[PDB]
Amino acid sequence: ESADLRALAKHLYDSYIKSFPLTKAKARAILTGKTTDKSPFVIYDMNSLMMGEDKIKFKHSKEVAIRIFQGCQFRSVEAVQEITEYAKSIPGFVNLDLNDQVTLLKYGVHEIIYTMLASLMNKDGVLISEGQGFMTREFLKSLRKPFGDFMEPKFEFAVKFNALELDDSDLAIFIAVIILSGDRPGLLNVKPIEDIQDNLLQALELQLKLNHPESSQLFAKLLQKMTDLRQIVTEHVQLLQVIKKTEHPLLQEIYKDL
Amino acid sequence: ESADLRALAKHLYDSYIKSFPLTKAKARAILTGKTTDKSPFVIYDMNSLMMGEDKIKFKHSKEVAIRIFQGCQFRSVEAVQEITEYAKSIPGFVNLDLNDQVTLLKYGVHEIIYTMLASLMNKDGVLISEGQGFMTREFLKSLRKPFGDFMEPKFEFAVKFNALELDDSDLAIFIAVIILSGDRPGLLNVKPIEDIQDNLLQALELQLKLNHPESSQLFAKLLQKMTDLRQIVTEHVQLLQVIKKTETDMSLHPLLQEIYKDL
Ligand SMILES: *c1ccc([N+](=O)[O-])cc1C(=O)Nc1ccncc1
Ligand SMILES: *c1ccc([N+](=O)[O-])cc1C(=O)Nc1ccncc1
Ligand SMILES: CCCCCCCCC(=O)O
Ligand SMILES: CCCCCCCCC(=O)O
């Protein structure tokens, strides 16, 4: 019944607005200069970076590309918590085996992070720190190996992902689909997981149809992007290993892999 | 609104289950004799100790007292890792300044060790190796000179703390109150810490009165235990500085060494 699919779609959208501060509707305004009420500090090279810690406050000898990467880790840890709280609002998620919940979040966050990073990106850079900042794609490239290689694949993916012109109400259901993948390693009771993903998949299909009637087979194209996602993540984890032989103790524990 | 504080209580209980594999409910099922859990092998002398590595999974002629000490030292490392994971689930914690996160963990972690260790203790001893073993208080107090006195203050606190009859969902909120202190030496921005803790304190208070309605002033009686916790740490680090000079061949784990900072 489409009423329950539209009900589910509104629920997830509300829960996604509450859980993720900087939404795509918001970030799209800041990036296009439409909402001139406040313009982010742009970081385009070293001196703009050094200046950037003065305007935008952060927490942090200690080379530039390392400090940027560390701040990227800091932000990752925050996004995990926002994702965890979003997941808890997906109908049926909390009722799952606690270990399956943990396994679903553990393998699902890198996918969701790069998905949602695309909301903050265009071909020329990425909003940082709630969008008070904008780090140019070209400045991120100008970092030494392996660090200049780090964000370029994500920019690459976002440019194509954003060409789908999804909005927050679309993404809210997409993100739920990603979390409820029954093929994560080590799951103990795949059935209720896949039962929820089928229900979320129906909701996503009805949503893309009404929200994008002119976008033929958008549902399928969005599902195909989850290929680019998994390949992104696979390439991302190995880079992190290369880094773990380029670069404390309590910090090491806060930034355990994931 | 109570509903908001109940939701926070459920959130923290949920994350506590996910971060701490040996809960108090499990540990009491093992200690009291329930059939949901199985029987510990009991170490009370060197013979039973020697049988323990056979029967119980350990990881370890580097004399008995030192061997126990390195084993209990490696378990502390694992507990620190577990506490660090639970902390990141405390809402607002990861949004704090990174320096204050490290500082909250550095001081909060040992007070949490001995709070939760109380869950593994009764009058007579303490579970070990994820509840597969049980090391008697007497065998611990009988260890040589310096080492014989490491655990007895923990047993003394645990016996009084356990008298409160807190359960895991109480402990989850209480451990979060501990982490978000704000009176820790060196904190850069005390106010966002104190705002979180006040929410935790509100959460703990509603939880204690719903979960233990007959237990008058349990909230206040639980906050006063934070003093016994402070005292247990200080005795510990001073006893640690003795071993550092006695056995200058004994090594401390780096995670644990950085947590310990003179003055
Ligand atoms: C930066 C550095 C390391 C990792 N990681 O090892 O998972 C991830 C990131 C990253 O891109 N974090 C991020 C999350 C959300 N928004 C922006 C950046
Ligand atoms: C024993 C010896 C040294 C230290 N330390 O420097 O923190 C800790 C311990 C100890 O009691 N570890 C422990 C933690 C949690 N559960 C059981 C034992
Ligand atoms: C210094 C802020 C870092 C936030 C992470 C957003 C992506 C850009 C980066 O790699 O730093
Ligand atoms: C060999 C592991 C030791 C378990 C650590 C628990 C603390 C109490 C003790 O060690 O006796």
Residue numbers in the entry:
A (entry chain B): 207 to 266, 274 to 460, 466 to 476
B (entry chain A): 207 to 266, 274 to 476
Give passages from the manuscript.
The nuclear receptor peroxisome proliferator-activated receptor gamma (PPARγ) is a target for antidiabetic drugs, including the thiazolidinedione (TZD) class of molecules. The distinct pharmacological phenotypes of PPARγ ligands are dictated by ligand-dependent recruitment of transcriptional coregulator proteins (coactivators and corepressors) to the PPARγ ligand-binding domain (LBD). The LBD contains the orthosteric ligand-binding pocket, which is the binding site for endogenous and most synthetic ligands, as well as the activation function-2 (AF-2) coregulator binding surface. The AF-2 surface is composed of three LBD structural elements: helix 3, helix 5, and the critical helix 12 that moves between two or more conformations in the absence of ligand.
Here we compare two commonly used covalent PPARγ ligands, GW966221 and T007090722, which were originally defined as antagonists not because of their effects on PPARγ transcription, but because they covalently attach to C285 within the orthosteric ligand-binding pocket and physically block other ligands from binding PPARγ. GW9662 and T0070907 contain the same 2-chloro-5-nitro-N-phenylbenzamide scaffold but differ by a simple atom change: a ring carbon in the GW9662 phenyl group is replaced by a nitrogen-containing pyridyl group in T0070907. Crystal structures of PPARγ bound to T0070907 or GW9662 reveal no major overall structural differences that explain the difference in efficacy. Strong electron density was observed for T0070907 in chain B and lower, less defined electron density in chain A. In both structures, PPARγ crystallized in the same space group and contained a dimer in the asymmetric unit with the expected α-helical sandwich fold. Chain A adopts an active conformation with helix 12 docked into the AF-2 surface; however, helix 12 in chain B is distorted due to crystal contacts and docks into the AF-2 surface of a neighboring symmetry related chain A molecule, thus influencing the conformation of helix 12 in both chains. Focusing on the pyridyl ring of T0070907, we observed a water-mediated hydrogen bond network connecting the pyridyl nitrogen to the Nε atom in the R288 side-chain. Furthermore, the guanidinyl side chain of R288 forms a bipartite hydrogen bond with the side chain of E295. In contrast, the hydrogen bond network in the GW9662-bound structure is not extensive due the lack of a hydrogen bond acceptor in the phenyl ring of GW9662. In contrast, T0070907 did not decrease transcription for the R288A or R288L mutants, indicating the R288-mediated pyridyl-water network is responsible for the transcriptional repression conferred by T0070907.
